[PDB]
Structure formats: structure tokens, C-alpha cells
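Onboarding guide, step 5: your first structure request.
Type a short instruction followed by the sequence, for example:

Predict the 3D structure of this protein.
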Amino acid sequence: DSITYRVRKGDSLSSIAKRHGVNIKDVMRWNSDTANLQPGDKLTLFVK
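The system replies with C-alpha cells like these:
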């Protein structure tokens, strides 16, 4: 399945991964433009 998390202010990419025990690096592995990490944007957490 694909995880979708909305990055809110105070939310960090790596910190968000911790919420699902995932590897945000893998997130940066499938995504090449993480510039969409804005306060209110969703993010792919294919990370396991």
C-alpha cells in the first residue's frame, strides 16, 4: 500500500517517518522533487 502523510508546520520529514518507523530516505528515493513538503502537503511514505 502507499502511505500519504501531510507535512504540517513542526512536522519534519524524518520525524514523520518515525511516526510510521519508515525510511524517509526511501521516500526521497522514489520522489525526486520533495519541494512539495509544505505545511499542508501530502507526502508518499512507500517506506516500510
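Each response can be followed by summary notes, for example: Residues 13-20 form the longest helix (8 residues).
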